[PDB]
Amino acid sequence: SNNLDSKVGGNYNYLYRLFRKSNLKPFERDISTEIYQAGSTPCNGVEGF
């Protein structure tokens, strides 16, 4: 779909999920936008190391 979905300035309306605490089961969908703690610390608020 390089004729329908690509833009000369880049199209960024399409996303994937890069992080998750667990792999999802067959035909599941995850709408969550919770922040992913990759470190051993917890974190609170919108972003962190």
């Epitope: 329908l4 979905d5 300035g9 199209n11 309306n13």
Partner: antibody
Framework: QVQLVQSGAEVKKPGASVKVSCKAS????????IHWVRQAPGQGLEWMGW????????NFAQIFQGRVTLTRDTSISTAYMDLNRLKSDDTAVYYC?????????????????WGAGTTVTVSS | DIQMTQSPSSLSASVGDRVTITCQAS??????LNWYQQQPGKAPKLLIY???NLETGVPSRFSGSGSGTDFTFTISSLQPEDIGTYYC????????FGGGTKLEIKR
């Protein structure tokens, strides 16, 4: 049989507010964007507003920011624009129109069908 | 902002005569331009999208061409139903509209 209907004529003072409705029918309202446009008498088309009937995500032309509110009623298949602190040149024909369901590009806005038009009048 | 300039204020032409209407942009829109008509006292109607593709159920004697900065809308013959006002709209950043070329019959 896609039919797009709007509220009738409105008579308003300068500095006041006006709410114009956009009743969808013949298709699933949550399937595509609704765009708002307005044509002043003897003038060119003027876009200002777009609102995703599924998400409620909303965006504007810069000169209408803080003046126009766009909203939607998925239960009643109806979009609305609500316009505040009405200027004398807010006197225009206003339209809602629909973004493309079929064989376009994924960004493109378009106006495949337009409502009956609402003739809002602002005067002292 | 992205300015749509459009050069004819109004056009006078006869039945069977060719019409070309020009729209142009401040920078490369690449392909991201749509064309419409409005008939007198009635709402707008889409004719060409993606600077080239003809709308469903509209007669083949409408045409569209051009890319990058500049875009041309074309009619082979302005039969009296085509009379009205013609608008281009870009989509590279927000919808923005051209001037509004009127059609007039050459009598």
């Amino acid at each position: 049989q896609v039919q797009l209907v709007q509220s009738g004529a409105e008579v308003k003072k300068p500095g006041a507010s006006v709410k114009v409705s956009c009743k969808a029918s013949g298709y699933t309202f949550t399937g595509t964007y609704i765009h708002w446009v307005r044509q002043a008498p003897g003038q060119g088309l003027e876009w200002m507003g777009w609102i995703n009937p599924n998400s409620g995500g909303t965006n504007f032309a810069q000169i209408f920011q803080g003046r126009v509110t766009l909203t939607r009623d998925t239960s009643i298949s109806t979009a609305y624009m609500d316009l505040n602190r009405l200027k004398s040149d807010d006197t225009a024909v206003y339209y809602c129109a629909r973004d493309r369901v079929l064989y376009g590009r994924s960004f493109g806005w378009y106006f495949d069908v337009w409502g009956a038009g609402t003739t809002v009048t602002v005067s002292s | 902002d992205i300015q749509m300039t459009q050069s004819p204020s109004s056009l006078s032409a006869s039945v069977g005569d060719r019409v070309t209407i020009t729209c142009q942009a401040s920078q490369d829109i690449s392909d991201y331009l749509n064309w419409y008509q409005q008939q007198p006292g009635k709402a707008p109607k889409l004719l060409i999208y993606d600077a080239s593709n003809l709308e469903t159920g509209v007669p083949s004697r409408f045409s569209g061409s051009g890319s990058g900065t500049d875009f041309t809308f074309t009619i082979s013959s302005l039969q009296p139903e085509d009379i009205g006002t013609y608008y281009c709209q870009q989509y590279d950043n927000l919808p923005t509209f051209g001037g509004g070329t009127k059609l007039e019959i050459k009598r």
